Amino acid sequence: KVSEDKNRNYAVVAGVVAIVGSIGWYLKA
Amino acid sequence: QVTPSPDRVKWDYRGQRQIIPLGQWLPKVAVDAYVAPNVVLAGQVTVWDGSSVWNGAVLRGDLNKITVGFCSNVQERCVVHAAWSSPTGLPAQTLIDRYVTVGAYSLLRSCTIEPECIIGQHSILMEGSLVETRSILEAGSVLPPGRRIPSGELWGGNPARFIRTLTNEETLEIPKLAVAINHLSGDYFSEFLPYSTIYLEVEKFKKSLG
Amino acid sequence: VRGSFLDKSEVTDRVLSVVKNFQKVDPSKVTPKANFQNDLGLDSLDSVEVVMALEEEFGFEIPDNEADKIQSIDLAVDFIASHPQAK
Amino acid sequence: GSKKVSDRIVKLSAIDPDGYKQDIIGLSGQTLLRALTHTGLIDPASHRLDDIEACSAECEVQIAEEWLEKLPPRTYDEEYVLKRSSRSRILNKHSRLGCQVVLTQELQGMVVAVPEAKPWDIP
Amino acid sequence: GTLGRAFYSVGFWIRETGQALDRLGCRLQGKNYFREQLSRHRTLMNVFDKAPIVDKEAFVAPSASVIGDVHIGRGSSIWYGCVLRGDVNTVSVGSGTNIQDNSLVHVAKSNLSGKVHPTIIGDNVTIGHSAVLHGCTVEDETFIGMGATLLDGVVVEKHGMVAAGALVRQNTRIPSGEVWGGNPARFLRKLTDEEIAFISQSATNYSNLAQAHAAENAKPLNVIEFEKVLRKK
Amino acid sequence: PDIYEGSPTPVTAFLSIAPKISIFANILRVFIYGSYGATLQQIFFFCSIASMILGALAAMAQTKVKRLLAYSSIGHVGYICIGFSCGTIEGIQSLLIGIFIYALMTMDAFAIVLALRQTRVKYIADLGALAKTNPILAITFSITMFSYAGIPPLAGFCSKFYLFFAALGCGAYFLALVGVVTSVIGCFYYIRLVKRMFFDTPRTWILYEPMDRNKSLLLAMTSFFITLFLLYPSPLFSVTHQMALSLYL
Amino acid sequence: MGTLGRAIYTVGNWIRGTGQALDRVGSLLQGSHRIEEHLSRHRTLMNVFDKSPLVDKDVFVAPSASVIGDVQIGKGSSIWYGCVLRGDVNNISVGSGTNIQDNTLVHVAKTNISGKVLPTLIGDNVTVGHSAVIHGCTVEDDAFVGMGATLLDGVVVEKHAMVAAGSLVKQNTRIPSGEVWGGNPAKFMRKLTDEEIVYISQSAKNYINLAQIHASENSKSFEQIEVERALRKKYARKDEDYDSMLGITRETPPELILPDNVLPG
Ligand SMILES: C/C=C/C(=O)SCCNC(=O)CCNC(=O)[C@H](O)C(C)(C)COP(=O)(O)OP(=O)(O)OC[C@H]1O[C@@H](n2cnc3c(N)ncnc32)[C@H](O)[C@@H]1OP(=O)(O)O
Ligand SMILES: CCCCCCCCCCCC(=O)SCCNC(=O)CCNC(=O)[C@H](O)C(C)(C)COP(=O)(O)O
Ligand SMILES: [Fe+3]
Ligand SMILES: [Zn+2]
Structure with missing residues (x-):
């Protein structure tokens, strides 16, 4: 029901932020 | 008295594990080698690049090292084993060198096969025996312990006896046979993706069971 | 040039002199093939003495299982002429 | 079976650096290095080929003169390697x-x- | 042909991508069961388009290996540990034929030693335990002894018997009613009518025993053993 | 040569590239930007000639891969210093181009050496039958070796071309002779490695563990650069010309 | 855990759904030709005709072995990889401390052509070599059957008797004690020395030790398999120099150490 590894969740969020930031960086440059 | 145990497994849903480690003895398979799904490799087994091991073969390296050299093939239902020591006194590892064709249903134990040889189907090579380079054994041959197959000759029988001397074209044919068998094994290698989908079947078989 | 073994003839000579100088060994039965017990009249205590007299002369220690396969002058010379630790 | 591995077996003895003598076994037609590596007297990993171009005298041995007569004389490349590796x-x-x-x-x-x-x- | 092989290859690229995606989805949920070493053995395996065609009445043991173009007829049986490989050429097995445990029925892997002969097994044929048939033909109602080896080009005529442990050399034609044995196989004696009766009665019995074995293997997999293996400590 | 051989192989890889860039920058800014007689140019000229000769002969004598690469690097610094000696804008440009191409080629070679060091490659003879046991790797190492030898159209040909160009312009003919002889010697001892991987049939083979993804990606990129740089070389030429002028103006 | 954990769980569910849909689309492009791998249906131990195999507690049965029907296996025995012991039409009995090596077939006969049809009886401390064929015969205690041998119905191998490797022993043949037979057909070769009797006994005793390590490995669960895979990876190489700089000594865990009775020394 829930993923419990909090470090893994933080890393997943960091990877998502990296991807979305790269997309926005390209789109606004 | 034969006293059974209730917890002995009668049906293992995983089947037989292909790679059987024994302590720190982990079988080593080259990334470009073909090993059939129902093969068992146990212990000190090294399967090198371009080599193939076919259905029903058993390679048990629990007493000594077992090596399948470059572009060598062990065919269907062969058993390759090894002993602690050889009657000859030489190291008793089972060494299958490069470009060696081990015919189906052959039994090898603590024998050395030099490069570019052919072992006929249903042959037996016993402890400490040596097959020198560029030799061919006929199907059904039995090589007793410590016996030797001289280079450039054709041998066969039970026990193996000298038949004749090989022509040079015949000896050129051997690595070609090994290469052709490797080419065939590539077709089987391409039928398997790096992961199976069995784990999904295990998942649903669990889910149906709560 | 540097050598790693004593010359065989030079060893034969050094061993021949050691065995002869040992008392109870008359310089008449001492041939390069002569045996200590059967042909020289040396018992076990005298026989072990000869072998370690070979250790002092050549300045190295003979493992015991080799000290036993040295029952004659050939076997001793065969051993010292092929042992690198001999000097 | 007419031809046997024991036909090619050459008896040998090797004296280790600590001085203890060992009876070792090798096949005629193969090198002394391979006989020495069978029992680990010389590490097989230190000398994997029997080629003079892959040698830094890791395979070096000392042989008394009575056996040197029975071997082919050293070539120039061998003596070059031995001298430089000393x-x-x-x-x-x-x-x-x-x-x-x-x-x-x-x-x-x-x-x-x-x-x-x-x-x-x-x- | 080439187009089918290209489509089969491109399908593997899409499948490998999908399976990797599924593994990513499990890793996000903290599941690692995809790492379990489970047997990839298939009783019936295809080599591209070459797939085994097996009659609905023919019993095949789950541990048997049937590879490529392999035809099995009605009432036939493939027992435990048997291997049948039909890649470079076809393997056909007639009706009412039993291939006993650990037998190997295969064709040549390469055409280096000549054109690759197929393997033909007739009807009501008995193949004994751990026999090796390589590119030969076996006619109807013949007996192949356990541990025998038949090389390529071998013809075993109807009512012919290969003794146990016999090595039949290449292109060796066994005439009808003859017992051949030894290494190499040579004529030994003529077959008797009682032997012919025993051959037929044996193949009929094996079809009935195979029916029994095909029923017990069909039993649903025990969930108790599954739970025992899952809960080991 | 001794330090390159004795250090761990990653250390050798780092020393064969990074410190050359830093010190050639220092040399160009201390002397070219400076002012003295041709004395210093004669210093680098004579050192270049000695370096080519000694590097070529000593590399010809080597039986081990690392020592061969070390002496090859010595020969190539000689080739590079020829560009400093002539004292022109094109001399500095060609020196920078040579440093760049030698760095890329050296990284290619050391990626191959580090890949083979998992099986403990030590001798040139250890590469026997590599064209059989890993055909793509043997071709990649051969492309690098032919680039090292300067055979066109590979990227290594630029250094040879400028060596001969500066000599026939600065008026030197002894230098041209030394370059010809050293180039031929270098070609011999480079193609010896191709002969070992492709032509020899040793009794005993060495089977090498496949390399990791990092070295394979770097090898693929450097191999594409080596085979294809001369098809589209303009950015390197223009950036090196830009740098050469930034030194003075 | 929490809202972020649930969100990532739902996203992973979507990702798995997409992955399986892509897998199906690829399968359709393959032309439905590839036969799918399925859950293993091999039964190591199986009943037939209401007969259940009777296996002692400390018997190594390889998972790939097929033990079927009325089969009895005694203490300390071992059934190796690919072995088939089909006791469906008659009884198969295996004694204590007996090894049946890889890819062996043991079968019985309901009725032989002539004489009295008997079950397959294998005694105690008996070695049966790789890929042997044992059909309706009797092997008494402390006997040796070489690899690739074939024993037909009615064969009797007596105590301290040896059948050589590759032998075809004809029906109703009796191998007397202290004798070694071989060939096709098998026949008397020579007498067995005392050292060879010692060899036979040491063979059975060595295989009881080998059976233990193989039985231990084959019965490990998924979690233990993964733990030991990680351990094996962690201890495959060493940097004892950096350990000495750190002042620590890394020890091999006991789960990776084999018992001394199986080591060559
Ligand atoms: C620790 C684990 C232990 C185990 O479980 S063992 C695992 C599996 N290993 C085995 O089964 C090995 C079994 N060993 C044997 O079978 C072996 O042969 C055997 C042990 C009979 C005999 O081996 P020998 O080397 O001792 O054979 P002989 O000394 O009797 O030679 C007699 C003669 O018979 C002939 N020869 C011998 N053996 C055989 C045969 N069988 N057939 C035909 N012909 C033969 C041959 O012509 C011989 O003449 P030569 O070649 O001139 O010496
Ligand atoms: C530097 C000094 C420090 C050490 C001090 C030394 C002290 C030594 C005193 C103690 C040692 C003994 O006496 S220990 C007593 C030794 N005596 C015996 O062994 C009695 C049996 N005799 C025999 O075995 C033989 O007569 C014999 C001739 C010996 C050999 O046998 P052979 O006939 O087959 O040559
Ligand atoms: Fe050497
Ligand atoms: Zn049967």
């Missing part, structure tokens, strides 16, 4: 490259001295 850069007259000695039936009973191993694993 610590003192002195050629040893009893030294042979084990990878260049081929065992024969005429070498039965030969005694070989195994010197202390040189470093070989270049970082």
Whole structure:
């Protein structure tokens, strides 16, 4: 029901932020 | 008295594990080698690049090292084993060198096969025996312990006896046979993706069971 | 040039002199093939003495299982002429 | 079965750096180095080929003169390798490259001295 | 042909991508069961388009290996540990034929030693335990002894018997009613009518025993053993 | 040569590239930007000639891969210093181009050496039958070796071309002779490695563990650059010309 | 855990759904030709005709072995990889401390052509070599059957008797004690020395030790398999120099150490 590894969740969020930031960086440059 | 145990497994849903480690003895398979799904490799087994091991073969390296050299093939239902020591006194590892064709249903134990040889189907090579380079054994041959197959000759029988001397074209044919068998094994290698989908079947078989 | 073994003839000579100088060994039965017990009249205590007299002369220690396969002058010379630790 | 591995077996003895003598076994037609590596007297990893171009005298042995008569004389390349690989850069007259000695039936009973191993694993 | 092989290859690229995606989805949920070493053995395996065609009445043991173009007829049986490989050429097995445990029925892997002969097994044929048939033909109602080896080009005529442990050399034609044995196989004696009766009765019995074995293997997999293996400590 | 051989192989890889860039920058800014007689140019000229000769002969003598690469690097610094000696804008440009191409080629070679060091490659003879046991790797190492030898159209040909161009312009003919002889010697001892991987049939083979993804990606990129740089070389030429002028103006 | 954990769980569910849909689309492009791998249906131990195999507690049965029907296996025995012991039409009995090596077939006969049809009886401390065929015969205690041998119905191998490797022993043949037979057909070769009797006994005793390590490995669960895979990876190489700089000594865990009775020394 829930993923419990909090470090893994933080890393997943960091990877998502990296991807979305790269997309926005390209789109606004 | 034969006293059974209730917890002995009668049906293992995983089947037989292909790679059987024994302590720190982990079988080593080259990334470009073909090993059939129902093969068992146990212990000190090294399967090198371009080599193939076919259905029903058993390679048990629990007493000594077992090596399948470059572009060598062990065919269907062969058993390759090894002993602690050889009657000859030489190291008793089972060494299958490069470009060696081990015919189906052959039994090898603590024998050395030099490069570019052919072992006929249903042959037996016993402890400490040596097959020198560029030799061919006929199907059904039995090589007793410590016996030797001289280079450039054709041998066969039970026990193996000298038949004749090989022509040079015949000896050129051997690595070609090994290469052709490797080419065939590539077709089987391409039928398997790096992961199976069995784990999904295990998942649903669990889910149906709560 | 540097050598790693004593010359065989030079060893034969050094061993021949050691065995002869040992008392109870008359310089008449001492041939390069002569045996200590059967042909020289040396018992076990005298026989072990000869072998370690070979250790002092050549300045190295003979493992015991080799000290036993040295029952004659050939076997001793065969051993010292092929042992690198001999000097 | 007419032909046997024991036909090719050449008896040998090897004296280790600590001085203890060992009876070792090798096939005629193969090198002395391979016989020495069967039992680990010389590390097989330190000398994997029997080629003079892959040799830094890791296979070096010392042989008494009564057995040197029975071997082919050292070639120039062998003596070059032995001399350069010496610590003192002195050629040893009893030294042979084990990878260049081929065992024969005429070498039965030969005694070989195994010197202390040189470093070989270049970082 | 080439187009089918290209489509089969491109399908593997899409499948490998999908399976990797599924593994990513499990890793996000903290599941690692995809790492379990489970047997990839298939009783019936295809080599591209070459797939085994097996009659609905023919019993095949789950541990048997049937590879490529392999035809099995009605009432036939493939027992435990048997291997049948039909890649470079076809393997056909007639009706009412039993291939006993650990037998190997295969064709040549390469055409280096000549054109690759197929393997033909007739009807009501008995193949004994651990026999090796390589590119030969076996006619109807013949007996192949356990541990026998038949090389390529071998013809075993109807009512012919290969003794146990016999090595039949290449292109060796066994005439009808003859017992051949030894290494190499040579004529030994003529077959008797009682032997012919026993051959037929044996193949009929094996079809009935195979029916029994095909029923017990069909039993649903025990969930108790599954739970025992899952809960080991 | 001794330090390159004795250090761990990653250390050798780092020393064969990074410190050359830093010190050639220092040399160009201390002397070219400076002012003295041709004395210093004669210093680098004579050192270049000695370096080519000694590097070529000593590399010809080597039986081990690392020592061969070390002496090859010595020969190539000689080739590079020829560009400093002539004292022109094109001399500095060609020196920068040579440093760049030698760095890329050296990284290619050391990626191959580090890949083979998992099996403890030590001798040139250890590469026997590599064209059989890993055909793509043997071709990649051969492309690098032919680039090292300067055979066109590979990227290594630029250094040879400028060596001969500066000599026939600065008026030197002894230098041209030395370059010809050293180039031929270098070609011999480079193609010896191709002969070992492709032509020899040793009794005993060495089977090498496949390399990791990092080295394979770097090898693929450097191999594409080596085979294809001369098809589209303009950015390197223009950036090196830009740098050469930034030194003075 | 929490809202972020649930969100990532739902996203992973979507990702798995997409992955399986892509897998199906690829399968359709393959032309439905590839046969799918399925859950293993091999039964190591199986009943037939209401007969259940009777296996002692400390018997190594390889998972790939097929033990079927009325089969009895005694203490300390071992059934190796690919072995088939089909006791469906008659009884198969295996004694204590007996090894049946890889890819062996043991079968019985309901009725032989002539004489009295008997079950397959294998005694105690008996070695049966790799890929042997044992059909309706009797092997008494402390006997040796070489690899690739074939024993037909009615064969009797007596105590301290040896059948050589590759032998075809004809029906109703009796191998007397202290004798070694071989060939096709098998026949008397020579007498067995005392050292060879010692060899036979040491063979059975060595295989009881080998059976233990193989039985231990084959019965490990998924979690233990993964733990030991990680351990094996962690201890495959060493840097004892950096350990000495750190002042620590890394020890091999006991799960990776084999018992001394199986080591060559
Ligand atoms: C620790 C684990 C232990 C185990 O479980 S063992 C695992 C599996 N290993 C085995 O089964 C090995 C079994 N060993 C044997 O079978 C072996 O042969 C055997 C042990 C009979 C006999 O081996 P020998 O080397 O001792 O054979 P002989 O000394 O009797 O030679 C007699 C003669 O018979 C002939 N020869 C011998 N053996 C055989 C045969 N069988 N057939 C035909 N012909 C033969 C041959 O012509 C011989 O003449 P030569 O070649 O001139 O010496
Ligand atoms: C530097 C000094 C420090 C050490 C001090 C030394 C002290 C030594 C005193 C103690 C040692 C003994 O007496 S220990 C007593 C030794 N005596 C015996 O062994 C009695 C049996 N005799 C025999 O075995 C033989 O007569 C014999 C001739 C010996 C050999 O046998 P052979 O006939 O087959 O040659
Ligand atoms: Fe050497
Ligand atoms: Zn049967």
